[PDB]
Ligand binder design. Structure first.
Ligand SMILES: [Zn+2]
Length: 73
């Protein structure tokens, strides 16, 4: 007549962290409004280019230099 006991208890516990961290900011169209500020009153657009200027003296010689005349520098 012998004796033998049984009680050695072990159980898991705890969990993992997976907290979300990746918030992104957004900006307005700064490119258009800064260009708009640089434009005088009339957008000096080259009708033969589709190019936008705000300087008249640039546009006035630019439309001239479009023809095969005038020295290139
Ligand atoms: Zn042009």
């Amino acid at each position: 007549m012998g004796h033998h006991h049984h009680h050695h208890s072990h159980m898991p516990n705890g969990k993992l962290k997976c907290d979300v961290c990746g918030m992104v900011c957004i900006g307005p169209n700064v490119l258009m409004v800064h260009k708009r500020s640089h434009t005088g009153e009339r957008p000096f657009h080259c009708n033969q280019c589709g190019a936008s200027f705000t300087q008249k003296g640039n546009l006035l010689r630019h439309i001239k230099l479009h023809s095969g005349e005038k020295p290139f520098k």
